[PDB]
């Protein structure tokens, strides 16, 4: 290793952007942006592996460059 001095575009997206993944919620969760029970598409949305939030495939764009920060209750 120890290779790769430079050769990449300007990293200008967000500090700590949420990192969701295509997963199925066993139970109907509620969005944090739209605030609508995620039941459509057989409860298929986006779950963050950091804050553990639920958002529709469209409710993510609004939180694409939003600093990930979620509490730990439970
Ligand atoms: Zn997050
Ligand atoms: Zn939503």
UniProtKB/Swiss-Prot annotation:
It is found in: Cytoplasm; Cell membrane, Sarcolemma; Cell membrane, Sarcolemma, T-tubule. A zinc finger (Phorbol-ester/DAG-type) spans 17-68. Interacts (via SH3 domains) with the calcium channels CACNA1S and CACNA1C. Component of a calcium channel complex with CACNA1S and CACNB1. Component of a calcium channel complex with CACNA1C and CACNB1. It is linked to Congenital myopathy 13: An autosomal recessive disease characterized by congenital weakness and arthrogryposis, cleft palate, ptosis, short stature, kyphoscoliosis, talipes deformities, and susceptibility to malignant hyperthermia provoked by anesthesia. Required for normal excitation-contraction coupling in skeletal muscle and for normal muscle contraction in response to membrane depolarization. Required for normal Ca(2+) release from the sarcplasmic reticulum, which ultimately leads to muscle contraction. Probably functions via its effects on muscle calcium channels. Increases CACNA1S channel activity, in addition to its role in enhancing the expression of CACNA1S at the cell membrane. Has a redundant role in promoting the expression of the calcium channel CACNA1S at the cell membrane. This is SH3 and cysteine-rich domain-containing protein 3. It comes from Homo sapiens. The gene is STAC3.
């Amino acid at each position: 290793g120890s290779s790769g001095s430079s050769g990449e575009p300007p990293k200008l997206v967000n500090d700590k952007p949420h990192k969701f993944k295509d997963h199925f919620f066993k139970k109907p969760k509620f969005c944090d942006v739209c605030a609508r029970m995620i039941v459509l598409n057989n409860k298929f949305g986006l779950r963050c592996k950091n804050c553990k939030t639920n958002i529709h495939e469209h409710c993510q764009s609004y939180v694409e460059m939003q600093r990930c920060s979620g509490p730990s209750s439970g």
